[PDB]
Amino acid sequence: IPPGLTELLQGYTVEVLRQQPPDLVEFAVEYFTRLRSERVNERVKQLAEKAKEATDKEEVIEIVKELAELAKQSTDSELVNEIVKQLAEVAKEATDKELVIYIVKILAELAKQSTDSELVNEIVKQLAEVAKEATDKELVIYIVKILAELAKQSTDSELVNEIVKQLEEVAKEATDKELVEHIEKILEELKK
Amino acid sequence: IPPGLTELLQGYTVEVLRQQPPDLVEFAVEYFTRLRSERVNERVKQLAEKAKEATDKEEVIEIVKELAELAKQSTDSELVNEIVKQLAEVAKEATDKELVIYIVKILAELAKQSTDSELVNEIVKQLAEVAKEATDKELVIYIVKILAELAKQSTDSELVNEIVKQLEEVAKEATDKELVEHIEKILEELKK
């Protein structure tokens, strides 16, 4: 017998006897989905604390890699959004530009592959936040072009309008005149 | 102990011992989701057979009601798509116009509430099929207006384009001159 099987089935048995569900299969899906959700949520919270306490870029990169793979393998929209929030905090904290770029690309890839419009909209806002904080025009224009790609690959006019609005604020907050003119040119293209 | 608990847990235990999964909770979610899916798929197949053998609309109406509630409570896009196909077959067979209207309204409500664009596109095609087969101009214009509502409530240009294409074919197949002009008038509005 593999370790934990007895305790796992005993836990489900207790709740069956307490709650007296009419359909044990339905109730099993609910019970074990909850346990899976509780465990992965705690793993994500543990990784976030570990990334916050880490004193080395290599430890943070390995945490980011595990978060990216958890997000990719999950179909739970709520969990992916929480992982996106936690990756955003790591990128904000990061002082190694390689790590910020790595996170930006994880977010870009998650957004481009997702069919959940609420999630893509949240990722748009997190990417624009990184661009607003950046003090490197090459990073800003990189993110702006990622957002422009999301807009042109979308047939959802509401997503396009939110990206346009985010890009207008990024142009407002950017300090290099040539960079601002470049963003405004990408903007007018999306408005057409 | 409730009936079936022992056998249910023994079945999961066999597969745990056969496949030796590294994560028993993950494996439980997979195992019980498959059993749930197998059982509801079989229920839908027997409802469809029962609807085909039924000899009175009252029995068919009760079957349609159970299919509509299974579709509403599921989060499995594949199952809902299969239920929509079975409702479409019931509407095709139906010779009581109240039953066809009832099915049209179930499909309309499913589509208007869904965030799954593949499902909405399939339902659009099923509604258009009912309109193409209809020999009652009041039913045709009802369905056309349902599709126009879906188009105007969508911000997805690809859904609007598919609806326009379906409406053009409905107008082609409709035989009443005033009805056709009405559909073409709704068509031009959507193209605008």
Residue numbers in the entry:
A (entry chain A), B (entry chain B): 5 to 196
The authors write:
In the fourth test case, we connected PKA_RIIα to a synthetic repeat protein, DHR14. In the crystal structure, the two helices were fused into a single extended helix, as expected. The DHR14 module appears to be rotated ~8 degrees relative to the initial design, presumably because of an opportunistic interaction between the loops connecting the third and fourth repeats of the two DHR14 structures. As a control, we also produced a fusion protein of PKA_RIIα and DHR14 by the end-to-end fusion of the connecting helices. The resulting proteins were produced in E. coli but could not be crystallized under our standard set of 1,152 screening conditions. This is presumed due to high structural flexibility at the fusion site because isolated PKA_RIIα and DHR14 proteins could be crystallized under multiple conditions using the same screening solutions.
Here, we propose a method for generating proteins and protein complexes with complicated shapes using fusions of alpha helices. To design amino acid sequences that can stabilize the alpha helical structure of the fusion sites, we superimposed one or two turns of terminal alpha helices of connecting proteins using a molecular graphics program. Then, the amino acid residues important for forming a fused helical structure were chosen from the two natural sequences in the superimposed region.
